[PDB]
Write a protein that binds this DNA or RNA. Structure first.
Ligand code: MG
Ligand code: ZN
Lengths: 221, 25, 71, 102, 220, 134, 82, 129
RNA sequence: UUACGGCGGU
RNA sequence: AGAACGAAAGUCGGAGGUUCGAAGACGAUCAGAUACCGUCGUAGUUCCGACCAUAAACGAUGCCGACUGGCGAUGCGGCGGCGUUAUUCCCAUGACCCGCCGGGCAGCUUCCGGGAAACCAAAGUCUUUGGGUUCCGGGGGGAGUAUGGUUGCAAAGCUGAAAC
């Protein structure tokens, strides 16, 4: 976004830095020399956030350019990313696939699990590669929010943020869910969007109900 | 028959005729 | 690799005249020993007298006696 | 067909290695084809540990280990079954088997 | 009676996609055979190439399947090639037409020189390899005819092409490969950039986004 | 010899998916329900299906089994949709960075726009776990 | 393709990749044609029109489609200007 | 040991145009290969290329457009007469619509079509299409 | 530890 | 053309002669054992000098040159940097650590492309065929045989057909 309206909005740096999103892990693929800033003394590559902001806007410009909103298929295989992928579909009205992706979904036209989408967006290239190589057969442009680890074979608008921790993935679904509605007549750029980024994050292990009812002895009782 | 032992029973044979020509000069 | 330059036509033409001696149908037609050896002597037909009828036996899959002479 | 990329042997920039001899059958193999096995077997045979330490003249005696390197021809490495035939795609790894001591 | 399952076959029975040559240029994966039967119906003759009895060794006897080779096509720039194993000839030879029309390409026709009228030969000399056979289709002057072996001449006359010099290297008695080798050469006449295709292509609107109406308004 | 076939397991899953409101952990009650609600051709696979149902009764009262029945499908809305917490996991206003990535956001022109205290990084550079088996 | 009569004698004009300038074939089923929708200046919403880019499958499989689509958004007035 | 410098340069262009690259680096420069490249730039195959002047033999950086199919070389510089040229055209050109066998004449490094608009048969130097 | 053979054409 | 070097065995002569060990002797095992298995053991294996010039002498891939993906590692130099460890209580060089560059033995990946495929970052840049140059292949056998020549002390080596 080459504008002043679509600029960085310094508030988001207080959300990006509080959720990871700029920490590549160990090594960087050769097609991500340009998205990086430098390597730490920790060995971790840290990421130019100006480069990951200009990509995060660019991906929604294709998704807005998809006419039917329930036509981009949004997919996620790893669990850290399975809660956020559903809600995003519930936000922008898309169609989600979470869990196992049955091969033959995009190309075997007989069975009733046959999705025919015009664009696809991925949580992880290297762990969720089966829709990617199947998108190669049915000429389908793909986005994948990617880390320095991941290869970029069939992806096109690879978001160079992070795909590893729980907080980084749900925020990048949140920042992308926010920004695709904000290119339409739903959010007027002024009032901040009331849906909390903690909504999209990966769910805790089984002490979920126990902690909240241990702190609700004055609202139910 | 092995190729190295087809070789032995002709190297043994072309010294047997190298003497017969030598005998009957 | 082979030769290519605007001066090697002695090498290529000399390399071809001695490698043509390695297929049979040039070698039996230009060495001379193959026609000083066939019974026809380089002709199509030949008269000759019959010495003895002989009956040769056909190949293994089959089984018959093919009728022959000893001209 | 060439079966393996290296020829079963770890020589690359050489022409000749030392020949060593097999342990059980005493066969001449090169040093880098032969199947090696370094054995750190305890010499006390652990079933008889609480039978000698109560006959020992000590109260805490660290028993010596036995340090034997085996190295086999592959003719006796398969027959003694220290190596097993592998499938053509599970074969392209040099990683050793896991240990599983306790 | 034919109801479709894909978008590209859904947008054809209501007669909204016209004249196939755009679903070539957006490179759609054609899935049903009825789309190509819809546009090019009453212009397809479908003659076979060879039916060869391949077979495997089993525990008692031999499974014998049949390998039917049929090539399809008009006389105006479309060919197919169908190959299918099945247990019996008459169902192998049947379903291979379904495979032959479903894999259909446009061949590009050009000139030997003096571009006076309709194109008659390949635009340039082109090659196709499949296994060990390479077939080199060479632009012929007008009034030559197809100078080739019998079976690639079965596809050239079925390509609507007038005349083509031809050479071929390899085991040309391998009719399954010698037909796929000649199919690959005329499958890349539009995959070769000539100086009439230099100017930057204006990109028209694809039928999956130009016809979002009929999937939103009528289908849903 | 106990192990149950595919048609007993398949047809019992379509009961508990569809008639969970009527079933319980008694064999002799569910044996009567599956008689009434399915068409079972003979008596042996009637009470062989009904045994796997009650085995699925104690199984689904613990957790999320392959159980797309409505109550197990509705309660996960209280997990993924709810817990929008009253406090943020994003907003703490005292967050750490490093002196190389305080250079990063300064060319982003956000160096004096933020609070953003730094932590000095270790100079050890020990990253890269040791090579080889030991 | 403009014979000497001056007529278009051609089934179709195939697309060409905006990255590698080579022709997308009739059955190159990895060639994408996707849209990038620009916004108006003052408010940043979708104004109705968009811009198309075709990326052929041979340059897509090679793995620098993202280097491609950024480079032609860099040249065509969208991403960053720095 | 570089026996031909036009052969090495034009091998180097051919590998990167099929690789998808926008620029090449041609390590020796010559006055035969800057007159070779401004026969295909003029017919419209490559774009702006720069000569990098050094005091030893210079370098060349060529901006590839994508309109190139193959830019080989005929490595023995055979002699071709204008009687003999027509059987050179149908061997190593894909068509009679396009492509050029570029050959050095006494009047300069030309096309094949420039060679017969003049009457200037020469030595064949390479081909490109 | 010892364990060798099985006519020809279909 | 012409040269130098060339494993092992082999030859001639001289020292040596532990081990092993062709031949051989015997034990066994076997229908037979001139074999495997065991005991013994000559030539030999070791050194010196003179010969012989072949090996699955293999990466079954000639040499030189260029271009064409990535990644981790190694080896030898060179350069550049947080720190840690050495008389060092301060040094300069070591030792580890993080990179870069060059040459090297390799490896993992990859629809670069190739290929009859196995597979190869070369066996790629080849019907869109031409970077230089040497050797060598033309169905299977007969046959590396015959014979002429030549090298050797011999064994044999190089050269090397044809009828069929
Ligand atoms: Mg032998
Ligand atoms: Zn052994």
């Amino acid at each position: 976004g080459a504008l002043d309206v679509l600029q960085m909005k310094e508030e988001d740096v207080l959300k990006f830095l509080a959720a990871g999103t700029h920490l590549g892990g160990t090594n960087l693929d050769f097609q991500m020399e340009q998205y990086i800033y430098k390597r730490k003394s920790d060995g971790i590559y840290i990421i130019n956030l100006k480069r990951t902001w200009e990509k995060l806007l660019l991906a929604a410009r294709a998704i807005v350019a998809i006419e039917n909103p329930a036509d981009v298929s949004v997919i996620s295989s790893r669990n850290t990313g399975q809660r956020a992928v559903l809600k995003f579909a519930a936000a922008t009205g898309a169609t989600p696939i979470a869990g196992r992706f049955t091969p033959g979904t995009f190309t075997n036209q007989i069975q009733a699990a046959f999705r025919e989408p015009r664009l696809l967006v991925v949580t992880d290239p290297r762990a969720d590669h089966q829709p990617l190589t199947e998108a190669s057969y049915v000429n389908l442009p793909t986005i994948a929010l990617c880390n320095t680890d991941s290869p970029l074979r069939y992806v096109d608008i690879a978001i160079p943020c992070n795909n590893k921790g729980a907080h980084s993935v749900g925020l990048m679904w949140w920042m992308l869910a926010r920004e695709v509605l904000r290119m339409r007549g739903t959010i007027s750029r002024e009032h901040p969007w009331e849906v909390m980024p903690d909504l999209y994050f990966y769910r805790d292990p089984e002490e979920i109900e126990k902690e909240e009812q241990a702190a609700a002895e004055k609202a139910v009782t | 028959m092995r190729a190295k032992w087809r070789k032995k029973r002709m190297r043994r044979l072309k010294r047997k005729r190298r003497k017969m020509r030598q005998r009957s000069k | 690799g082979k030769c290519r330059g605007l001066r090697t036509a002695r090498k290529l033409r000399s390399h071809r005249r001695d490698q043509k001696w390695h297929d049979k149908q040039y070698k039996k037609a230009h060495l001379g020993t193959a026609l000083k050896a066939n019974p026809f002597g380089g002709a199509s037909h030949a008269k000759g007298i019959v010495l003895e009828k002989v009956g040769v036996e056909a190949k293994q899959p089959n089984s018959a006696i093919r009728k022959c002479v000893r001209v | 067909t060439k079966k393996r990329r290296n020829n079963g042997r770890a020589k690359k920039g050489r022409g000749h290695v030392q020949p060593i001899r097999c342990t059980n059958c005493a066969r001449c193999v090169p040093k880098d084809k032969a199947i090696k096995k370094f054995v750190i077997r305890n010499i006390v045979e652990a079933a008889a540990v609480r039978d000698i330490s109560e006959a020992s003249v000590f109260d805490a005696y660290v028993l010596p280990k036995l340090y034997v390197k085996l190295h086999y021809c592959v003719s006796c490495a398969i027959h003694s079954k220290v190596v097993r035939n592998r499938s053509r795609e599970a074969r392209k790894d040099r990683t050793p088997p896991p240990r599983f001591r306790p | 009676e034919w109801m479709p399952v894909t978008k590209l076959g859904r947008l054809v029975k209501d007669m909204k996609i016209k004249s196939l040559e755009e679903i070539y240029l957006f490179s759609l994966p054609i899935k049903e055979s009825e789309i190509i039967d819809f546009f090019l119906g009453a212009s397809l003759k479908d003659e076979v190439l060879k039916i060869m009895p391949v077979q495997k060794q089993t525990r008692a006897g031999q499974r014998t399947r049949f390998k039917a080779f049929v090539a399809i096509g008009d006389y105006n720039g479309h060919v197919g090639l169908g190959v299918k194993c099945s247990k019996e000839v008459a169902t192998a030879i049947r379903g291979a037409i379904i495979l032959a029309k479903l894999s259909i390409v446009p061949v590009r026709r050009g000139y030997w020189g003096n571009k006076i009228g309709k194109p008659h030969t390949v635009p340039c000399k082109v090659t196709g390899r499949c296994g060990s056979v390479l077939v080199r289709l060479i632009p012929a002057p007008r009034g030559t005819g197809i100078v080739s072996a019998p079976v690639p001449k079965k596809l050239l006359m079925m390509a609507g092409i007038d005349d083509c010099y031809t050479s071929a290297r390899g085991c040309t008695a391998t009719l399954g490969n010698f037909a796929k080798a000649t199919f690959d050469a005329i499958s890349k006449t539009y995959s070769y950039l000539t100086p009439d295709l230099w100017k930057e292509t204006v990109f028209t609107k694809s039928p999956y986004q130009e016809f979002t109406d009929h999937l939103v308004k009528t289908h849903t | 010899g106990r192990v149950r076939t595919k048609t007993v397991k398949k047809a019992a899953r379509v009961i508990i998916e569809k008639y969970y409101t009527r079933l319980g952990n008694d064999f002799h009650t569910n044996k009567r329900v599956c008689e009434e609600i399915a068409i079972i051709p003979s008596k042996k696979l009637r009470n062989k299906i009904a045994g796997y149902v009650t085995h699925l009764m104690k199984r689904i009262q613990r957790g999320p089994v392959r159980g797309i029945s409505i109550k197990l499908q509705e309660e996960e809305r209280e997990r993924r949709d709810n817990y929008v917490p009253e406090v943020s996991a994003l907003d703490q206003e005292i967050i750490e960075v490093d002196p190389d990535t305080k250079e990063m956001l300064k060319l982003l022109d956000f160096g004096s726009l933020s609070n953003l205290q730094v932590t000095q990084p270790t100079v050890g550079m020990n990253f890269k776990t040791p090579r080889g088996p030991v | 393709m403009q014979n000497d009569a001056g007529e278009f004698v051609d089934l179709y004009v195939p697309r060409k990749c905006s990255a590698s300038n080579r022709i997308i074939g009739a059955k190159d089923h990895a060639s994408i044609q996707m849209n990038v929708a620009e916004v108006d200046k003052v408010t940043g919403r979708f104004n109705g029109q968009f811009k198309t880019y075709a990326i052929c499958g041979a340059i897509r499989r090679m793995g620098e489609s993202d280097d491609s689509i950024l480079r032609l958004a860099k040249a065509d007035g969208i991403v960053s200007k720095n | 040991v570089r026996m031909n410098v036009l052969a090495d340069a034009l091998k180097s262009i051919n590998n990167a145009e099929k690789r998808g690259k926008r620029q090449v680096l041609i390590r020796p420069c010559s006055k035969v290969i800057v007159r070779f490249l401004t026969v295909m730039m003029k017919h419209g195959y490559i774009g702006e290329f720069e000569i990098i002047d050094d005091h030893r033999a210079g370098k060349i950086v060529v901006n590839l457009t994508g309109r190139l199919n193959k830019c080989g070389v005929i490595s023995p510089r055979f002699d071709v007469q204008l009687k003999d040229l027509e059987k050179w055209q149908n061997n190593l050109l894909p068509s009679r619509q396009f492509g050029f066998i570029v050959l050095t004449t006494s009047a300069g490094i030309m096309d094949h079509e420039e060679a017969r608009r003049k009457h200037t048969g020469g030595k064949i130097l390479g081909f490109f299409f």
